[PDB]
Design a protein around this ligand. Structure first.
Ligand SMILES: *[C@@H]1O[C@H](CO)[C@@H](O[C@@H]2O[C@H](CO)[C@@H](O[C@@H]3O[C@H](CO[C@H]4O[C@H](CO)[C@@H](O)[C@H](O[C@H]5O[C@H](CO)[C@@H](O)[C@H](O)[C@@H]5O[C@H]5O[C@H](CO)[C@@H](O)[C@H](O)[C@@H]5O)[C@@H]4O)[C@@H](O)[C@H](O[C@H]4O[C@H](CO)[C@@H](O)[C@H](O)[C@@H]4O[C@H]4O[C@H](CO)[C@@H](O)[C@H](O)[C@@H]4O)[C@@H]3O)[C@H](O)[C@H]2NC(C)=O)[C@H](O)[C@H]1NC(C)=O
Ligand SMILES: Cn1c(=O)n(Cc2ccc(F)c(F)c2)c2cnc(Nc3ccc(C(=O)N4CCC(S(N)(=O)=O)CC4)cc3)nc21
Ligand SMILES: [Ca+2]
Ligand SMILES: [Cl-]
Ligand SMILES: [K+]
Ligand code: NA
Ligand SMILES: [Zn+2]
Length: 805
């Protein structure tokens, strides 16, 4: 109940919301059906439109008008945004030359440059080039300020998850808004685009920027506008708030536009009908900039122009139906469209079985346009598993397609021509970022980055300490002229042991054999030097990784590779080696096929054993440094040390052996040498964070050898590929992956073919940032380079996406 009999007189777009049953006058009151009876009359004036005309100049103030052109309008703060242009001979902001803003030029009483976030729905990255002729205000922000060629959204590429990630710096699995539609089984409640459940604060986790600001004494405008409030009124309201007295005036504001998304769904991303919505949003930007210029704030405020996601061509006929796969289609509930989420229709149905659903949906039709996954098996880069609102069964839908439960759902729920929501590496889903103002750089292009990084920068722009989030603070320092955040590298928690030769061969009873009984003082000193680290500068190019948790581990040096060997998990945490452009690939010699050799530096008690592998009929093993890339026949023996062995399913060994035998040398050829760091990851609770030992669900049978859930590799070279990886003077280039360690290749529909037809495609799907691997391992990489720490933070957030231009 609301007592709508109260009045909005002197309260229009009040900043503090009042509690029921008192009636409201704030920018969300319409959404709650709770505005005072006179809100439209007082707060949503429209008389005479949004623009001054010559005949209105110096008019007697009429309080009924939408905006004013009377002499007192600047002091009242309520002129139409074109007032000074029409009535005072001034230029529109867009017509002015750009001039570098070296320092804030702010009116007296301003304690900091305000921040205005201008967010646009469905603004695909390529609109900046393709719509350039019709968006002169946005093009001026872009060219004069700091811009990226695109910004990567989070998955799913829908509005609610992305706007709330922009506001929090958190992945959707952590902030809790994991779709536009959700069921929470603990609450037994459903969140939808339509209706009141979505207003309950229990869905919304993390700490969004407006709360961060308020808690730290920085006042905020309200960031939500009821959809029926026209954009012109939203802009005027922002400009009116910016005329409040200092102690009442917010320092951070947000505008959101439902366009161009609304028209893109109707017309497709590049429908001819899309020019007008792009022109209209540009005109709104121009209203804001003209208004700021009026207030003498156009060289004071930082403006961020940012999208939530892009838009792809999607039509009703490109729909896959689960009724063409499942015999049992009425026993499931599907969240449908550009992703699928499946759960049981009834929790009382004890016949429901996820394994049989997944099997029925796996590689059943030759050009199948979706792929099923249990959520823990999705690419780790999507960070889309650790939330009870994310169903265990997920369908990743191909770009341009939908999935639905039955055909009738498509015509009893063609209309639309555009949609979005697909994997966030898809080109059409990319969106936009421009920052303009005194704190951003001038005429600067920055590389693409992820929207999770922006919260920390918005906090930097406002002098706020960010709440804990998934950005890497400092990775976007290169966007900023000032207010940079200068982090220190984390301190190493565990220092390595450096074992020498401590055990005789007969102390080991591992059930291993090797044909290595072969025959020299010239070479003898050389072998000793290699084991004490003489080649370590060649193979450990950026310092040893730091271990940021408490554990026991040993550094082991070899001619061709260096490793950090865990005494707790019985295998390397990391193995580092460099492969030059000139390196040769060799075979594993016939007589060494099953060779595994005790490591006389590491106790039998802290070693794996071959008998466990023999007995475990499902599990085999592989090596982290590949025997194929040994520098000589003699050095190859080191590759078969028990301290270089890791548990591998046979199906996974197909993938791993092709990576090691074919792809590493391909990359060294293309990149002019590569440095490779590889290792295991354990994430049995799919939280994106390193497991402790007591979280491990699977061991090699009869042993305490834990089975990794994934294997990673970080592949680094010189950005200037005229310099070899091991003699690089300048910035680096990296690509990384986190491959799921699975007992089958059901993910790869073409896996019965030769590895040359499917393995690199799998690897591309499971591309990763170095930072993802850091979270999953508790390791910190790139400790000792010639590069600035912020540059290295940027490198650790890079994702190699494998999309065309
Ligand atoms: C991305 O960045 C984020 C933010 O930094 C990282 O997430 C943090 O990760 C931490 C570790 O996973 C986690 O720390 C835990 O916090 C517990 C207290 O949590 C509450 O309070 C905070 C602070 O205000 C709040 O933010 C939390 O918000 C979560 O939950 C609410 C409602 O339930 C949601 O609205 C909200 O969206 C958010 O949910 C997300 O996180 C939770 C986990 O907290 C997930 O379950 C959700 O799916 C969703 O992802 C909470 O309101 C604290 O109690 C924990 O301590 C336990 O473990 C330690 C082990 O050392 C032990 O000492 C304690 O005793 C305790 O264990 C006991 O409880 C166990 C569980 O029942 C039990 O099994 C044991 O036997 C013990 O009795 C822990 O410190 C932190 O909460 C989140 N924060 C957020 C915002 O998500 C995230 O990791 C980053 N991601 C990557 C990939 O890097
Ligand atoms: C979820 N969230 C936030 O975290 N903030 C705050 C914020 C966060 C970051 C910013 F950067 C910013 F500035 C503000 C928001 C501010 N406004 C809105 N308004 C919406 C959202 C969706 C729909 C809708 O129902 N749909 C999207 C539009 C389509 S359309 N185009 O088909 O109408 C229909 C579905 C209608 C209105 N949502 C917000
Ligand atoms: Ca984990
Ligand atoms: Cl959704
Ligand atoms: K075996
Ligand atoms: Na397969
Ligand atoms: Zn949309």
């Amino acid at each position: 109940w609301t007592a709508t009999s109260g009045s909005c007189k002197g309260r229009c777009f009040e900043l503090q919301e009042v509690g029921p049953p008192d009636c409201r006058c704030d920018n969300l009151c319409k959404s709650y059906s709770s505005c005072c009876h006179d809100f439209d009359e007082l707060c949503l004036k429209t008389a005479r439109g949004w623009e001054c005309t010559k005949d209105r100049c110096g008019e007697v103030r009429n309080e009924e008008n939408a905006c004013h052109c009377s002499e007192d309008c600047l002091s009242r703060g309520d002129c139409c945004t074109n007032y000074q242009v029409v009535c005072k001979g001034e230029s529109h902001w867009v017509d002015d030359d750009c001039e570098e803003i070296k320092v804030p030029e702010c009116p007296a009483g301003f304690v900091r440059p305000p921040l205005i976030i201008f967010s646009v729905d469905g603004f695909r990255a390529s609109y900046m080039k393709k719509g350039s002729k019709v968006m002169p205000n946005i093009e001026k922000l872009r060219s004069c300020g700091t811009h990226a060629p695109y910004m990567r959204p989070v998955y799913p590429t829908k509005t609610f998850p992305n706007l709330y990630t922009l506001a929090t710096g958190l992945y959707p699995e952590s902030h809790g808004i994991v779709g536009n539609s959700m069921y929470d089984p603990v609450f037994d409640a459903s969140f939808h685009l339509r209706g009141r459940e979505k207003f309950n604060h229990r869905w919304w986790g993390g700490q969004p920027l407006w709360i961060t600001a308020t808690k730290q004494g920085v006042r905020a405008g309200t960031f939500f506008w009821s959809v029926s409030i026209p954009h012109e009124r939203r802009i005027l309201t922002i400009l009116q708030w910016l005329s409040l007295p200092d102690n009442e005036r917010p320092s951070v504001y947000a505008f959101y536009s439902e366009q161009p998304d609304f028209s893109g769904h109707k017309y497709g991303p590049f429908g001819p009908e899309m020019t007008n919505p792009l022109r209209e949003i540009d005109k709104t930007v121009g209203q804001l900039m003209d208004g700021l210029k009026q207030l003498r704030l156009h060289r004071c405020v930082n403006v961020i122009f940012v999208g939530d996601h892009g838009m792809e061509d999607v039509t009703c006929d490109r729909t896959e139906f689960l009724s063409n796969y499942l015999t049992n289609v009425d026993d499931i509930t599907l969240v449908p469209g550009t992703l699928g989420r499946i759960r049981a229709k009834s929790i009382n149905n004890s016949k429901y079985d996820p394994k049989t659903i997944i099997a029925a949906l796996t590689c059943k039709k030759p050009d199948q346009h979706f792929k099923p996954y249990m959520k823990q098996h999705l690419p780790k880069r999507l960070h889309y598993a650790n939330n009870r609102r994310i169903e265990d069964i997920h369908l990743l839908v191909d770009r341009r397609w939908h999935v639905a439960r039955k055909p009738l759902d498509v015509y009893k729920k063609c209309f639309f021509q555009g949609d979005h929501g697909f994997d966030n590496k898809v080109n059409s889903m990319q969106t936009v970022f421009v920052g303009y103002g005194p704190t951003f750089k001038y005429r600067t292009k920055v590389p693409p980055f992820e929207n999770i990084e922006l919260y920390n920068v918005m906090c930097d722009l406002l002098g706020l300490k960010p709440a804990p989030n998934n950005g890497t603070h400092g990775s976007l320092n290169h966007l900023l002229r000032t207010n940079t955040f200068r982090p220190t590298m984390p301190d190493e928690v565990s220092r390595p042991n450096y074992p020498g030769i401590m055990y005789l061969q007969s102390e080991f009873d591992l059930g291993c054999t090797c044909d290595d009984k072969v025959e020299n003082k010239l070479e003898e000193l050389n072998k000793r030097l290699h084991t004490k680290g003489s080649t370590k500068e060649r193979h450990l190019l950026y310092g040893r990784p730091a271990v940021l948790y408490r554990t026991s581990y040993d550094i082991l040096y070899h001619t061709d590779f260096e490793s950090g060997y865990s005494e707790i998990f019985l295998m390397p945490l990391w193995t580092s080696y460099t492969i030059s452009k000139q390196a040769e690939v060799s075979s594993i010699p016939e007589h060494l096929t099953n060779c595994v050799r005790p490591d006389v530096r590491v106790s039998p008690g802290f070693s794996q054993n071959c008998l466990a592998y023999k007995n475990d009929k499902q599990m085999s093993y592989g090596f982290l440094f590949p025997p194929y890339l040994s520098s000589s026949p003699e050095a190859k023996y080191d590759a078969f040390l028990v301290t270089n062995m890791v548990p591998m399913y046979p199906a996974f060994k197909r993938v791993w052996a092709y990576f090691q035998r074919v792809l590493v040398k391909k990359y060294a050829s293309e990149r002019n040498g590569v440095n490779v760091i590889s290792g295991p990851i354990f994430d049995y609770n799919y939280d994106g964070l390193r497991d402790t030992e007591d979280e491990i669900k699977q061991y090699v049978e009869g042993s305490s050898i834990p089975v990794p859930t994934h294997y990673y590799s970080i592949i680094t070279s010189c950005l200037d590929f005229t310099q070899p990886a091991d003699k690089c003077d300048g910035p680096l280039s990296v690509s990384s992956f986190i491959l799921p360690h699975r007992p089958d290749n059901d993910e790869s529909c073409n896996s019965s073919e030769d590895e040359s037809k499917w393995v690199e495609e799998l690897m591309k799907m499971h591309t990763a940032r170095v930072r993802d691997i850091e979270h999953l391992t508790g390791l910190d990489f790139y400790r000792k380079t010639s590069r600035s720490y912020s540059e290295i933070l940027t490198l650790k957030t890079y994702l190699h996406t494998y999309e065309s231009e």
